[PDB]
Design a protein around this motif. Sequence first.
Motif, mmCIF file in Angstrom:
data_model
loop_
_atom_site.group_PDB
_atom_site.id
_atom_site.type_symbol
_atom_site.label_atom_id
_atom_site.label_comp_id
_atom_site.label_asym_id
_atom_site.label_seq_id
_atom_site.Cartn_x
_atom_site.Cartn_y
_atom_site.Cartn_z
ATOM 1 N N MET A 262 29.640 40.675 -6.360
ATOM 2 C CA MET A 262 30.206 41.514 -7.639
ATOM 3 C C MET A 262 31.194 40.561 -8.105
ATOM 4 O O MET A 262 31.361 41.122 -9.380
ATOM 5 N N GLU B 10 28.656 39.058 -10.171
ATOM 6 C CA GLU B 10 27.962 39.728 -11.244
ATOM 7 C C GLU B 10 29.040 39.978 -12.479
ATOM 8 O O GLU B 10 28.534 40.343 -13.411
ATOM 9 N N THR B 11 30.217 40.069 -12.137
ATOM 10 C CA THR B 11 31.263 40.606 -13.368
ATOM 11 C C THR B 11 31.894 39.517 -13.998
ATOM 12 O O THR B 11 32.722 39.815 -14.934
ATOM 13 N N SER B 12 31.181 38.234 -13.864
ATOM 14 C CA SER B 12 31.662 37.201 -14.593
ATOM 15 C C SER B 12 31.463 37.548 -16.114
ATOM 16 O O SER B 12 30.542 38.369 -16.499
ATOM 17 N N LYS B 13 32.048 36.876 -16.886
ATOM 18 C CA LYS B 13 32.163 37.027 -18.442
ATOM 19 C C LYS B 13 30.688 36.505 -19.365
ATOM 20 O O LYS B 13 30.474 36.740 -20.375
ATOM 21 N N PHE B 14 29.959 35.635 -18.136
ATOM 22 C CA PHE B 14 28.700 35.081 -18.648
ATOM 23 C C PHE B 14 27.666 35.370 -17.506
ATOM 24 O O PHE B 14 28.029 35.666 -16.412
ATOM 25 N N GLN B 15 26.522 35.433 -18.147
ATOM 26 C CA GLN B 15 25.537 35.652 -16.946
ATOM 27 C C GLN B 15 25.446 34.304 -16.101
ATOM 28 O O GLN B 15 25.549 33.188 -16.537
#
Lengths: 53, 60
Positions: free
Chosen positions: A40, A43-48
């Motif tokens: 996570m 998952e929570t990065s600013k980009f996919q």
Amino acid sequence: DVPIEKIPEHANVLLKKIDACLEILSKDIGEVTDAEAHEMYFETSKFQILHIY
Amino acid sequence: FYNLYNFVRIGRVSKYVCWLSLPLVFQRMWMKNRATGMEYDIDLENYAPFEAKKNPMHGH
């Protein structure tokens, strides 16, 4: 009923005991590296996430 | 808007649920236009006007 020569024997016994303790307590658990625990964070990065192969 | 939708991307439940109240907006958009010109009976409107003032059956 306890001569003074018998003291360092007791001290040696307790030294053995506390050394058996500290050889275990000297160990410690490091940071976890399992990716399932930190998935996570990505998952929570600013980009996919880019699956690049 | 990109920031907001980049955060919507990270949600789990709201990004798939909070849109289900949006069709209701179009329901109102359609029903309002249906009602703007709806033909009604004069007798029932004069006998039973909706939320009109000075109707003694309401109390005032």
